Design a protein around this ligand. Structure first.
Ligand SMILES: *[C@@H]1O[C@H](CO)[C@@H](O)[C@H](O)[C@H]1NC(C)=O
Ligand SMILES: *[C@@H]1O[C@H](CO)[C@@H](O)[C@H](O)[C@H]1NC(C)=O
Ligand SMILES: *[C@@H]1O[C@H](CO)[C@@H](O)[C@H](O)[C@H]1NC(C)=O
Ligand SMILES: *[C@@H]1O[C@H](CO)[C@@H](O)[C@H](O)[C@H]1NC(C)=O
Ligand SMILES: *[C@@H]1O[C@H](CO)[C@@H](O)[C@H](O)[C@H]1NC(C)=O
Ligand SMILES: *[C@@H]1O[C@H](CO)[C@@H](O)[C@H](O)[C@H]1NC(C)=O
Ligand SMILES: *[C@@H]1O[C@H](CO)[C@@H](O)[C@H](O)[C@H]1NC(C)=O
Lengths: 195, 183, 322, 48
């Protein structure tokens, strides 16, 4: 279903697409200030030297070479912000591949929605894409519950899970799957009386 | 132009009181807001109006060509008064008397009607109201649908245990690197 | 705004400012990116579930007391008293002095539905436990939902039930000291009161640069146009144009660094609500000092407040081991 | 083996050497930028 899912909508690969459009449109904006006037007489360099006073031309080119350098100074500052944003995700990506892939992570809602089982990395241009194989429950039923039990004048607490009654006979089962068993001392431990 | 001052605001009446020698009022943020008329020594008031952003709530180009022009923050009991030549820098002087308007917290929008259903949001607008495209094709505006109000059958004796499971493969996408550039 | 801030009500700057190129389209694009990033942060911090759950009518919860955190139906607003104490301490009439193109856009999520999201998260974390963030919601009683938080600490669940009443009033009174500690010192909301001050200081001081001379003869444009001719007024006003755009660029750069800081805080807050609320995190000194049981989220003006119900051992005793 | 691991090679503690050098030639370039004319007559203020 994934191969149909990744090509049905353009929003699946929109994050890596947005990465390459910011670096593309940064250079598209960058070349456009070369033709900018910046309050001078021309954008071509030889037109200043054609008729003006050469001391006045160097003053005229000073206000133009600072305007061109300020567009480059702004560009280096804008990449430094963007380099810190990707590094915040690259260190997250290295955290993901060292926990979700090389092991099982008990962090809830980190390596996938719901309970997480394993993962798979795949290579993409300028990034990485995961296949987080998770484990999510389904249809359920509701029962009547008691927090404990007492038989020989003495309270018994479950070793694991919770006591579950279907209406006539009690059962003990696992906390995340319906699997009823009969109540046995192997399934419980005793602590004090039941008063 | 009061005594050599420049400004293009309205002239209303204010309840503030000047000293007999304190002639020109001011505020914290260094703005002109009060003057004294030479001929009559009553107290005046200055404020400018109005300015704000203009947005084009539009669907895709291949879908249709109709629009929904939004006015940010401006009370639109004022913009149909301002229908005049050489007053509206936007060209559509006839659009101020158009379709049925609906008033939001961020300002009313002109060109879209209102509906009172609970639909999901496609194009966010702000302050709990947003637009979409619906069917007789026109742009609408409605309230956020935050999901169905699912109930909880909570009691002091009731557990809920699933009896089955579905393994799903969820896909998330993370960037790693960036195109290297040298200048 | 591009022209309104720098050369408002000045048509003759229009040919003088637009010849600089596409400079402020980048500024508008950057501020639009910040504006949509704020809405993305607000969307991904709070909306972890899509079903808005409801509290039960009766409010008995196994002997505990959650009257302060649930919304009060008597008030016209559907908020809790803890938000009532939190809202009055945060201060800011300050938007009326912004007639120079600085229009504060309202948030997409209004202040009422954020309280609905916090009420939904609270109704999930009391009645369902941790299973409502990992599939379908499974309702569970609270005296047994607490009994599976000791079991992930290191103590078995034989100490919760038999000391139920003694652990009830020890918790409820622990709520009460939160009621006056926010009003005990003004630094309690100091993580938020500075933040609204950071936009209070920066937006105000953005105004005073256009009031300054910036190396020119006057801070207003009409008088230098009047007494001095336009054939040598561009050499007087280019300083003002460059200084105002440089001040705007500096303000936007500081806004980008502050928004990166808020983004780094918001991802951490999303992680905290993802594991200190929807489960029980095992990382020591992450969801409060000591052993961690659960937590409750509370809304705040431009922020969030977590109540970590931690666990601390006491009254040690000496023994001889092998 | 830790002392011979760090004391022999000098690349063990570079992660603080570049930190204390990033705030070293930044100051040096900040001093050196006073020598630039910036399109003026001279780089000093008293003589002009
Ligand atoms: C199970 O839940 C449904 C609704 O969620 C409720 O109508 C029904 O009474 C519950 N069953 C029991 C045994 O309480
Ligand atoms: C509960 O389960 C037991 C064992 O399967 C069965 O004998 C009994 O009839 C069940 N009771 C109800 C009410 O379903
Ligand atoms: C200006 O002239 C009018 C008409 O005589 C008079 O009523 C008004 O008081 C005068 N104001 C001053 C300040 O002289
Ligand atoms: C516009 O002004 C009227 C005047 O009473 C007021 O009732 C209304 O709330 C205002 N609307 C906005 C959006 O400011
Ligand atoms: C669990 O779901 C699968 C998917 O349809 C189904 O084939 C299977 O029979 C279900 N098992 C139970 C016990 O309901
Ligand atoms: C909870 O505490 C409040 C006062 O703190 C009290 O008025 C209320 O009755 C209590 N509720 C329960 C169920 O004990
Ligand atoms: C244990 O004994 C030592 C020596 O008698 C003493 O210094 C220490 O304080 C004791 N610890 C406690 C918790 O009393």
């Amino acid at each position: 279903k994934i191969q149909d899912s990744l090509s049905s909508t353009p929003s699946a690969l929109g994050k890596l697409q947005d990465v390459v459009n910011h670096n593309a449109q940064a250079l598209n904006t960058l070349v456009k200030q070369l033709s900018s006037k910046f309050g001078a007489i021309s954008s071509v360099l030889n037109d200043i030297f054609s008729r003006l006073d050469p001391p006045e031309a160097e003053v005229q080119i000073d206000r133009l070479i600072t305007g061109r350098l300020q567009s480059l100074q702004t560009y280096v500052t804008q990449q430094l912000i963007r380099a810190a944003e990707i590094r915040a995700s690259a260190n997250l990506a290295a955290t993901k591949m060292s926990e979700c892939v090389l092991g099982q992570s008990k962090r809830v809602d980190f390596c996938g929605k719901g309970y997480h089982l394993m993962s798979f990395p795949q290579s993409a241009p300028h990034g990485v894409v995961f296949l987080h194989v998770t484990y999510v429950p389904a249809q359920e039923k509701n029962f009547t519950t008691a927090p404990a039990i007492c038989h020989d004048g003495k309270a018994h607490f479950p070793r694991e899970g919770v006591f579950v009654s279907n209406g006539t006979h009690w059962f003990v089962t696992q906390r995340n799957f319906y699997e009823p068993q009969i109540i046995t001392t192997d399934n419980t431990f005793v602590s004090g009386n039941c008063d | 132009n009061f005594n050599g001052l420049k400004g293009t605001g309205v002239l209303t009446e204010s309840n503030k009181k000047f000293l007999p020698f304190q002639q020109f009022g001011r505020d914290i943020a260094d703005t002109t807001d009060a003057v004294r008329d030479p001929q009559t020594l009553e107290i005046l008031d200055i404020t400018p109006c109005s300015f704000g952003g203009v947005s084009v709530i539009t669907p895709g180009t291949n879908t249709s060509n109709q629009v929904a022009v939004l006015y940010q923050g401006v009370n639109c009991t004022e913009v149909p008064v301002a229908i005049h030549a050489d007053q509206l820098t936007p060209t559509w002087r006839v659009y101020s008397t158009g379709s049925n308007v609906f008033q939001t917290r961020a300002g009313c929008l002109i060109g879209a009607e209102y509906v009172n259903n609970s639909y999901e949001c496609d194009i966010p607008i702000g302050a709990g109201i947003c637009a979409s495209y619906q069917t007789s094709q026109s742009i609408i505006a409605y309230t956020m649908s935050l999901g169905a109000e699912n109930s909880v059958a909570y009691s002091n004796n009731s557990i809920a245990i699933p009896t089955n499971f579905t393994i799903s493969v969820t896909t998330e996408i993370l960037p790693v690197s960036m195109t290297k550039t040298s200048v | 705004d591009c022209t309104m801030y720098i050369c408002g009500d000045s048509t003759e700057c229009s040919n003088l400012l637009l010849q600089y190129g596409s400079f402020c389209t980048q500024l508008k694009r950057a501020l639009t990116g910040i504006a949509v990033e704020q809405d993305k942060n607000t969307q991904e911090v709070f909306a972890q579930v899509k079903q808005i759950y409801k509290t039960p009518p009766i409010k008995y919860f196994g002997g505990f007391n959650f009257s302060q955190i649930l919304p009060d139906p008597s008030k016209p607003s559907k908020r809790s008293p803890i938000e009532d104490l939190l809202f009055n301490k945060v201060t800011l009439l300050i938007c009326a002095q912004k007639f120079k193109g600085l229009t504060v856009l309202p948030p997409l999520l209004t202040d009422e539905m954020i309280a609905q999201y916090t009420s939904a998260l609270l109704a999930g974390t009391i009645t369902s436990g941790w299973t409502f963030g990992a599939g379908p919601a499974l309702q569970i009683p609270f005296p047994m939902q607490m009994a599976y938080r000791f079991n992930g600490i290191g103590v078995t669940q034989n100490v919760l039930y038999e000391n139920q009443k003694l652990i009830a009033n020890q918790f409820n009174s622990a709520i009460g000291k939160i009621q006056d500690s926010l009003s005990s010192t003004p630094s309690a909301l100091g993580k938020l009161q500075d933040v609204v001050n950071h936009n209070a200081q920066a937006l105000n001081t953005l105004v005073k640069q256009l009031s300054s001379k910036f190396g020119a003869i006057s801070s207003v444009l009409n008088d230098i146009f009047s007494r001095l001719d336009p054939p040598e007024a561009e050499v007087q006003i280019d300083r003002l144009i460059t200084g105002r755009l440089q001040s705007l660029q500096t303000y936007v750069t500081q806004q980008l660094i502050r928004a990166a800081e808020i983004r780094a805080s918001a991802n951490l807050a999303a992680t905290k609500m993802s594991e200190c609320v929807l489960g029980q995190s095992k990382r020591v000194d992450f969801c409060g000092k000591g052993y961690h049981l659960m937590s409750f989220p509370q809304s705040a003006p431009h922020g969030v407040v977590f109540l970590h119900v931690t666990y601390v051992p006491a009254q040690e005793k000496n023994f001889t081991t092998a």
